[PDB]
């Protein structure tokens, strides 16, 4: 029964909620398990960046966020074409590629291919057979200069 | 008369032992166990009786095979091998 | 009854065999805690399941 001034409240507790309650006592353990898996993965991919592949520069869709730029799923096929990177070689050297994204304008397209050129210049490519370097990289550039990058590769800034 | 007099006339057993589950619920005239439903391939089990489920669930008996399975799992079910002779 | 099946007679045999007192030397075992057979059954008191 209502009593004096108040708010008309409509709690959603008419549906046997006590049988489906998610407690979070395993939250500190889940953070530990995720952290251990992150560390194990970084050890597995030894000199490769710990975060993963490089992601493209992407503008957020709606009118609320189109002034903001974030990281996308992968570089479009038009971007890789004019950057001179094969769409099947890109994934093996740590470039994420999104075949379903198009480029409506040349400003965002050219900004992402400059991103690919800069990454391709920063990339140290270990020879497939360490005894025989074919076209990868000089031994001086990988003797000690190859370290595991931490955080996103070339993080996207506004 | 429905009380003491009528209790004297009961001398024919409705149920007998069941060759599955060993309970005295095997209806003789219907040839069906009232606890496990024996001639049916599947064991009779209902979720409205959780107490009856835990009376006859896995673990309430011997587990002659599952005890060995739980032990053998700890070594990957190795076979055809022997400890190194002394 | 006199007429009985082999399964019934074998069931009655096991019930008969376990209807005996505990041995006296059980009571001298270490950490015994058992006083007497609490599963004793008298034919007139408690009727068998079958």
């Amino acid at each position: 029964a209502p009593s004096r001034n108040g708010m008309v409240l409509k709690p959603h507790f008419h549906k046997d909620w006590q049988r489906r309650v998610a407690t979070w006592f395993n939250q500190p353990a889940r953070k530990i398990r995720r952290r251990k898996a992150r560390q194990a993965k970084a050890r597995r991919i030894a000199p490769r960046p710990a975060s993963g592949p490089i992601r493209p520069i992407v503008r957020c869709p709606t009118v609320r966020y189109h002034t903001k730029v974030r990281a996308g799923r992968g570089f479009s096929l038009e971007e890789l074409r004019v950057a001179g990177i094969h769409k099947k070689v890109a994934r093996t050297i740590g470039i994420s590629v999104d075949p379903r994204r198009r480029n409506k304008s040349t400003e965002s397209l050219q900004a992402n291919v400059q991103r690919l050129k800069e990454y391709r210049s920063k990339l140290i490519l270990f020879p497939r057979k360490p005894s025989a370097p074919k076209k990868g990289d000089s031994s001086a550039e990988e003797l000690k200069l190859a370290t595991q990058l931490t955080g996103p590769v070339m993080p996207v800034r506004n | 008369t429905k009380g003491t007099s009528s209790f004297g006339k009961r001398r024919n057993k409705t149920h007998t032992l069941c060759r599955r589950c060993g309970s005295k619920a095997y209806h003789l005239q219907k040839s069906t166990c009232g606890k496990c439903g024996y001639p049916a391939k599947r064991k009779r089990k209902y979720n409205w009786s959780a107490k009856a489920k835990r009376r006859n669930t896995t673990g309430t008996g011997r587990m002659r095979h599952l005890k060995i399975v739980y032990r053998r799992f700890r070594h990957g079910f190795r076979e055809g091998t022997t400890p190194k002779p002394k | 009854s006199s007429h009985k099946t082999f399964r019934i007679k074998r069931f009655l045999a096991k019930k008969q065999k376990q209807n005996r007192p505990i041995p006296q030397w059980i009571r001298m075992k270490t950490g015994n805690k058992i006083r007497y057979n609490s599963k004793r059954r008298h034919w007139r008191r408690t009727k068998l399941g079958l």
Binding site: R48, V89, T92, I93, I124, R128, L149 | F77 | -
Partner: protein
């Protein structure tokens, strides 16, 4: 004066069966002495002889089984008890060969575009 598994293993089937028979006639004599009073020494030999019979029978069954394993070694079809008994589900799994064989399309993809080892400078 006892019997051990290790010195039973060199013996042949005939003298293993003869030793099994002699233990069986002694066990029957011990069961006779049990029901006619007997002595505590005779009663306590019942377990000793019973374990001896189990020891002989274990060696007999082990020698027979290990011979059958040798006989069926390298044959395409084996009796089910000589086959591995891992787990019903583990016996339904794909074997090691077919778990690892690839299509030619998958083989070219691995040959043409192998995953490279790389590092990214800061």
């Amino acid at each position: 004066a006892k019997i051990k598994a290790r010195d039973l293993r060199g013996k042949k089937k005939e003298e293993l069966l003869k030793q099994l028979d002699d233990l069986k006639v002694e066990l029957s004599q011990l069961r006779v002495a049990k029901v006619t009073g007997g002595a505590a020494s005779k009663l306590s030999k019942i377990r000793v002889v019973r374990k001896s019979i189990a020891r002989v029978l274990t060696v007999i069954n082990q020698t027979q089984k290990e011979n059958l394993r040798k006989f069926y070694k390298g044959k395409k079809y084996k009796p089910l008890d000589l086959r591995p008994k891992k787990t019903r589900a583990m016996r339904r799994r794909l074997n090691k060969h077919e778990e690892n064989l690839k299509t030619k399309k998958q083989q070219r993809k691995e040959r043409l575009y192998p995953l490279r080892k790389y590092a990214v400078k800061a």
